[PDB]
Design a protein around this nucleic acid. Structure first.
Lengths: 1129, 305
DNA sequence: TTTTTTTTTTTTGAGCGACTGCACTACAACGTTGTAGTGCAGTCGCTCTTTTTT
């Protein structure tokens, strides 16, 4: 390998950058981005400078892409400032400014890069795949709009249930017995194959043929058993082997066990006594007959139907899932990768790859250790050997810890074998040089410490600016790595975990007790910093050991947070308490639910309070009244106003903040309230949100929004974090209590050492188990390298002679089967004394060891401080007056028009019919039939409807007898919308008396009550029309349910006007029309131009009665001026 | 937030039925919640599953085993009950339901060969007792002349032993010289020898004092974890409790194993009645539970054979 | 076409592997008996990760 310089890297072909742990990888990506933007390098430069929309940056985590985009934006701004100033304070920026000859064009290009930073092509893997599938949809074959689903386990379980229905149901008893012996149901089969159903489908070594069913395999194994049974029945009754001292003379009784075994072939499990009839075992304890060799050939491979059912499940369930998602049109996260790989798999899609070479002629792929084989197949399809396009795989093989998710280090080894050039980062900028020397000492004990040939380890170099970092104690300078060796010969798992958790808690309380007095410090040169609780971090691997660390740390009065906590908030007790509270709010009449909700820990009441609440009826009446008020707020204002009024009236938030350990409960209550408010806006009913909350309590599925958050940020806490969640982070002091605990992989799923493909061995062959255990040990070594390289000042290790084997004292321990003992004992099995000598052999100034001491003196000291007085500001006045833009409604034989259905929708339909129809042209019956077809009414009403419409249009509505047919198109104006201003507070008492002074219809009609309305008033007049130089208004009222006879005279219409209060609407219409004719027409008089207002009741118009149906009214011409003066000011 | 445990005034009534004592000693914290202050935390019922039951586990398996054990205790036709359970859809379809019914019939026949080996026809009798000025009225079902015979398709637990001990105390106090036997699964058996009237009345007065103590204050007597701690600390050979550090650590290990179980078995601490009192199991409350279990659950393992 | 009621929970791990006790024959020390090796059965520890993509 070679060293990497960001200003001398040739950006041609494929390059492989191995950025070590703690190195400036994110800085190197920004440096290469600036190099690709400005086109720097000279002979090793790009042939042309590229824009922001041509540089492709690929990183898996979305937050990592956002952080990288922000860092690249900051680097672009800093380089633009340094190019405008021709000076900088950074040496890499100094060399970047020295490499360019021109300054104005580079500054203009950096300004255009800053302006085009929003359209930067820095996406994720699945985001880039979705963008390429939606962009070039023709060559790929992707729909334009699709619905992404977050959880795929439901459809996978449905397809597994369908496979179990269509495969396991028509089987007979002799096959279903073996199927039941393999798996109890489809859930166990899904739990077995769930790591293979997602992602790339693996290749099964020696698969069954496609025509072999379960019955053929069952008959084959039955015949294979029956042949051995026949050979035992033929060769029975003889004994010719020599009797040994190990071989007891009871073997004939075992032959009796083989005498009763051959009755039927309905079973599947043979006897263990056939193991006594093996020629390889009898010789070690003379076999001449081939019956023993036939028994050994029968027991050579396990008789199992499991592999064929697993192969049929992997052939059927994935196809059913893909067919269901093609039917529903949905897509998944890995489905984008599979669709892009199938598009590039085709013949035309290669040209699509050229389109990608037209789209981005460069690629910088970050986090190449987390690369699926589909992703590398795509990136090899696009950017293998084509000219003018560059590929930069920036990754680290020593950090590939996501093999459980779908990543694979054999893909990285294939990529390293395919590419030619290699570059590495020598300098490490994170940790102290003592920790760097400890890492380079522990991992360079033997050659190829990561046990693979294509993953070499190199000694990294520390930074020059961080060479003075020292974690100093009260005594002297503490070394970097302190391997706390637990003393003893052999120990269990739980006892070792408990002792190392107690030792870690004692070290945490010793660092915090001496840190608050100015003894333990972090010193950079001469600068010093006291160690707070946020500096010490415990690195665990599982949730159970994290809970063990938290329980062992909360006993010594030390609060700790779990950053890797992915548990749902709906699975706690607070969600059930909120469900009980919502059920008590929704149903406050039944006292049982209210009593069950009041006694919860959220309210916080004693048993005496509940007893006095059950005894006193008046206090329970007050509780029922305030819960009915909460129900009224919940029905009127929503979820969060009711919850805030409940938390403010009961004052439970202050009581939970006063209680120790209740702040996390309060943050969980607030998050549950936020999620209930987010789900309550999408639901109309009130009980539907309660059913949704009960369903989400019953559904423990984990979404990105429904996870537990950090409880507090101001108070420093000990941060427990898993190894996968600590990748790329930074911690001052790191404690590793369970770095020696290891777990043996049982399933046989490995990768071939030549083809580098995923090989799944369904049979229990020992070679596949060893080849899978080697990859498991390499994953454990990579986890060890990730967990060791996150400390800056000090890391502590927990070493112990752990024995996974069930024997207590066997003379050897299993630490060589772990990741730490493979570097300590150099990959050799030793004893506890051998482990102690291997620990004491590598003793330097940075690496020391001490024994594990079990002992506690005092938990901690609180050292609390007083709180200053604080108050909240109060608003002096009202926030706003009653300003609202409202309308009039805000201030308030067999076929006949009498038999028309009375409603709001037929009224609006008749209003639209009178609006759309022309008054000059005669009414056509087919147009009425078309309008009834568009509206959806009955077709039988149409010939009566058209003659009723013509009878309405023939009836004149004026004091002179003017019909609607005499109005031309320029004279009419339909649906005039007006806005009317008012600057005074509209008092109803000062307005109703002014109306009653002039309007004769206000003899009855007691006055309506409305608030002081100041602002604008909306209105929609139906029709305004002029005739013989006089303007007229026309409105439509069409409800008219209570009249069927000819009783709609002028008295009944006046009573309807007084009842429905259309007098105010007509008066506002006259005021608006007066103001409109005053603004439009110069030299305007109200008596000369205005003629009156006509109300047209549609169901009251008769052919013989011209007066019935119409209602003509003229104001007194003095109310309009006073109303204009009142509305003006 | 003040503590939920408060000394409440409670007067012991004259007539306390046997059903109230059985509901108290089935779960004392639940009986303090749902009967004294009448607070019963009613959880919502489970939703309908999306698929047919392929396996049998939980309440449905226990009901199937209960009906199969009640059918095999009278030597009835198991095939008729198989057709009855298959016609309702509670069994898996086809051969798998037959395999499940065959293994459950094998297990229930293995249990019935021990149950009806010492079974005699007995009728229900009346119980009218006067202990410490307290009247106890009730009925005991299936009282045979050999003693008390109960059978349940469950595991070896301390709550069923407490129930059998309460029935044996209420049976031996009014006549009834004889043993009391309960047969569980996996060769589990609770046996109590016959006692005199004085010892039975003394232990019944102790249980009545525990009942009147549980209504005023929450009686922190855990059956499973307290019984595990006691049977780790008890020695049946010398009739005395050990006090060495190894037994005191193994009893703490058994208490932490029975309180919070593994990721496959629901522990005793995962309950809606215990999380209301305390959020984290403090060692002071742990020692209080240990003292209450040593005070109350001691004749369970003292007279066990 | 009218109308009645009712408050009781229950269950849930088992296969892999070792420790120890009893039986059972092979073979050498002193025909018979003590010691050694192996098989079967009752009883008991242990243990079942990690995560994010529009």
């Amino acid at each position: 390998a070679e060293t990497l310089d960001p200003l001398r890297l040739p950006l041609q072909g494929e390059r492989l950058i191995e950025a070590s742990a703690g190195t400036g990888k994110t800085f190197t990506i920004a440096a290469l981005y600036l190099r690709l933007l400005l086109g720097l390098g000279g002979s090793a430069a790009f042939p042309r400078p590229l824009t922001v929309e041509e540089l492709l940056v690929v990183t898996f985590t979305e937050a990592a892409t956002a952080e990288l985009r922000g860092r690249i934006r900051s680097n672009i701004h800093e380089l633009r400032i340094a190019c405008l100033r021709e000076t900088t304070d950074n040496p890499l920026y100094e060399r970047l400014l020295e490499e360019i000859d021109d300054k104005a064009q580079a500054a203009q290009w950096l300004l255009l890069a800053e302006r085009q930073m929003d359209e930067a092509a820095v996406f994720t893997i699945h985001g880039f795949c979705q963008r390429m599938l939606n962009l070039n949809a023709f060559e790929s074959g992707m729909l334009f709009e699709q619905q992404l689903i977050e959880d795929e386990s439901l459809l996978r379980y449905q397809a597994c249930a369908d496979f179990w229905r269509r495969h396991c149901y028509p089987l007979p008893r002799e096959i279903a017995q073996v199927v039941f012996e393999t798996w109890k149901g489809p859930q166990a089969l899904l739990r077995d194959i769930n790591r293979y159903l997602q992602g790339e489908a693996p290749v099964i070594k020696a698969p069954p043929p496609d025509d072999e069913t379960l019955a053929s395999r069952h008959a084959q194994i039955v015949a294979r058993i029956d042949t051995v049974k026949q050979q035992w029945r033929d060769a029975v009754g003889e004994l010719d082997a020599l009797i040994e001292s190990s071989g007891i003379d009871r073997r004939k009784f075992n032959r009796s066990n083989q005498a009763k075994w051959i009755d039927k072939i309905s079973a599947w499990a043979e006897e263990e006594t056939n193991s006594y009839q093996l020629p390889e075992s009898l010789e070690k304890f003379t076999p001449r007959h081939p019956l023993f060799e036939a028994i050994d050939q029968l027991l050579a491979e396990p008789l199992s139907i499991r592999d064929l059912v697993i192969t049929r499940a992997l052939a059927e369930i994935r196809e059913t899932v893909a067919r269901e998602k093609r039917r529903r049109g949905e897509l998944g996260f890995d489905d984008m990768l599979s669709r892009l790989d199938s598009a590039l798999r085709s013949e035309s899609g290669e040209v699509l790859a050229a389109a990608i070479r037209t789209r981005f002629p460069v690629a910088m792929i970050d986090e190449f250790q987390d690369t699926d084989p589909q992703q590398y197949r795509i990136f090899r399809r696009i950017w293998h050997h084509q000219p003018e396009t560059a590929l930069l795989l920036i990754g680290d093989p020593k950090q590939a810890i996501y093999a459980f998710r779908g990543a694979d280090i054999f893909t990285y080894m294939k990529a390293r074998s395919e590419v030619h050039a290699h570059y590495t980062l020598d300098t490490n900028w994170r940790s102290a040089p003592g920790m760097v020397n400890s890492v380079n000492k522990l991992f360079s004990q033997t050659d190829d410490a990561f046990m693979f040939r294509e993953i070499p380890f190199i000694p990294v170099k520390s930074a020059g600016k961080n060479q003075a970092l020292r974690f100093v104690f009260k005594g002297e300078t503490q070394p970097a790595m302190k391997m706390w060796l637990m003393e003893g010969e052999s120990c269990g798992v739980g006892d070792y975990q408990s002792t190392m958790a107690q030792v870690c808690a004692a070290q945490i309380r010793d660092w915090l007790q001496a840190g608050q007095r100015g003894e333990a410090l972090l010193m950079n040169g001469d600068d010093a910093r006291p160690v707070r609780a946020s500096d010490i971090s415990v690195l665990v691997r599982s949730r159970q050991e994290a809970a063990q660390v938290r329980d062992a740390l909360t006993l010594l009065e030390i609060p700790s947070v779990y950053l890797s906590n992915r548990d749902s908030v709906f699975e706690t007790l607070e969600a059930q308490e909120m469900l009980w509270l919502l059920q008590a709010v929704m149903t406050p009449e039944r006292e049982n639910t209210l009593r069950s909700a009041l006694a919860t820990s959220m309210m916080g009441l004693n048993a005496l309070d509940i007893e006095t609440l059950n005894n006193d009826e008046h206090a329970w009446d007050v509780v029922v009244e305030e819960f009915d008020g909460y129900r009224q707020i919940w029905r009127k204002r929503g979820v969060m106003p009711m919850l805030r009024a409940l938390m403010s009236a009961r004052n439970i938030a202050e009581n939970l903040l006063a209680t120790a350990g209740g702040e996390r409960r309060l943050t969980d209550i607030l998050h549950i309230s936020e999620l209930l408010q987010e789900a309550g806006t999408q639901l109309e009913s009130e009980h539907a949100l309660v059913r949704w909350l009960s369903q989400h309590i019953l559904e423990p599925d984990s979404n990105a929004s429904s996870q537990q958050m950090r409880l507090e940020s101001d108070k420093h806490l000990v941060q427990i974090v898993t190894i996968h969640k600590s990748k790329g982070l930074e911690y001052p002091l790191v404690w590793l209590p369970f770095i020696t605990n290891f777990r043996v992989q049982e399933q046989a799923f490995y990768h071939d050492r030549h083809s580098f493909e995923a090989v799944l061995d369904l049979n229990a062959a020992p070679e596949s188990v060893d080849l899978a255990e080697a990859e498991r040990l390499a994953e454990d070594l990579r986890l060890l390298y990730v967990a060791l390289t996150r400390s800056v000042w000090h890391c502590s290790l927990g070493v112990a002679p752990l024995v996974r084997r069930r024997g207590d004292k066997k003379g050897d321990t299993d630490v060589h089967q772990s990741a730490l003992g493979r570097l300590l004992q150099k990959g050799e099995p030793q004893d506890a004394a051998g482990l102690r000598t291997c620990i004491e052999a590598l003793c330097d100034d940075d690496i020391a060891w001490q024994t594990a001491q079990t002992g506690d003196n005092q938990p901690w000291q609180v050292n609390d401080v007083s709180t200053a007085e604080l108050n909240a500001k109060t608003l002096q006045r009202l926030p706003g007056d009653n300003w609202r833009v409202t309308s009039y409604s805000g201030l308030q034989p067999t076929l006949t028009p009498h038999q028309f259905p009375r409603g709001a929708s037929p009224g609006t339909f008749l209003h639209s019919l009178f609006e759309d129809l022309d008054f000059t042209q005669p009414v056509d019956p087919n147009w009425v039939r078309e309008k009834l077809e568009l509206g959806g009414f009955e077709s039988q009403w149409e010939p009566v409807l058209t003659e009723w419409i013509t009878a309405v249009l023939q009836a004149p509505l004026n004091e002179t007898g003017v019909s609607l047919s005499q109005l031309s198109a320029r004279n009419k104006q339909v649906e005039m919308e007006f806005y009317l201003p008012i600057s005074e507070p509209l008092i109803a008492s000062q307005l109703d008396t002014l109306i009653r002074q002039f309007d004769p219809l206000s003899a009855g009609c007691p006055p309506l009550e409305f608030m002081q309305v100041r602002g604008m008033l909306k209105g929609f007049i139906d029709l305004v029309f002029r005739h013989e130089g006089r303007y007229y208004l026309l409105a439509y009222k069409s409800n008219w349910l209570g009249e069927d006879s000819s009783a709609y005279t002028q008295q009944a219409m006046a009573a309807a006007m007084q009842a429905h209060r259309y007098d105010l609407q007509y008066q506002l219409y006259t005021l608006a029309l007066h103001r409109y004719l005053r603004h439009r027409i110069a030299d305007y008089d109200y008596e000369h131009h205005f003629g009156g207002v006509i109300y047209l009741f549609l169901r009251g118009v008769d052919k013989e009665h011209p007066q019935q149906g119409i209602y003509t009214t003229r104001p007194n011409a003095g109310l309009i001026a006073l109303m204009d003066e009142m509305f003006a000011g | 937030h003040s503590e939920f445990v408060q000394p409440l005034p409670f007067t012991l009534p004259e007539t306390v039925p046997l059903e109230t004592l059985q509901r108290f000693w089935a779960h004392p914290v639940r009986a303090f919640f749902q009967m004294r202050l009448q607070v019963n935390f009613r959880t919502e019922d489970s939703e309908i599953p999306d698929t047919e039951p392929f396996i049998l586990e939980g309440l449905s398996r226990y009901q199937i085993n209960q009906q199969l054990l009640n059918a095999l205790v009278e030597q009835d036709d198991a095939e008729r009950l198989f057709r009855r359970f298959r016609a309702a859809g509670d069994l898996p379809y086809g051969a798998f339901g037959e395999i499940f019914w065959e293994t459950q019939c094998q297990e229930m026949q293995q249990l019935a060969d021990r149950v009806i080996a010492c079974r005699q026809p007995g009728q229900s009798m009346e119980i009218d007792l006067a202990c410490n000025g307290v009247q106890i009225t009730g009925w005991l079902p299936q009282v045979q002349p050999d003693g008390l015979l109960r059978w349940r398709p469950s595991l070896l637990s301390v709550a069923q032993g407490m129930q059998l001990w309460l029935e044996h105390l209420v049976y031996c106090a009014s006549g009834g010289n004889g043993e009391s036997r309960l047969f569980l699964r996996k060769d589990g058996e609770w046996r109590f020898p016959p006692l005199a009237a004085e010892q039975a009345l003394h232990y019944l007065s102790q249980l009545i004092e525990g009942y009147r103590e549980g209504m005023s204050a929450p009686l922190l007597v855990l059956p499973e974890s307290g019984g595990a701690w006691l049977k780790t600390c008890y020695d049946a050979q010398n009739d005395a409790m050990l006090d060495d550090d190894s037994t005191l650590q193994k009893a703490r290990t058994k208490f932490l194993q029975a309180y919070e179980g593994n990721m496959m078995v629901r522990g005793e601490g995962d309950d809606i009645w215990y999380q209301r009192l305390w959020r984290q199991l403090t060692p002071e409350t742990m020692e209080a539970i240990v003292e209450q279990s040593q005070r109350f659950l001691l004749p369970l393992f003292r007279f066990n054979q």
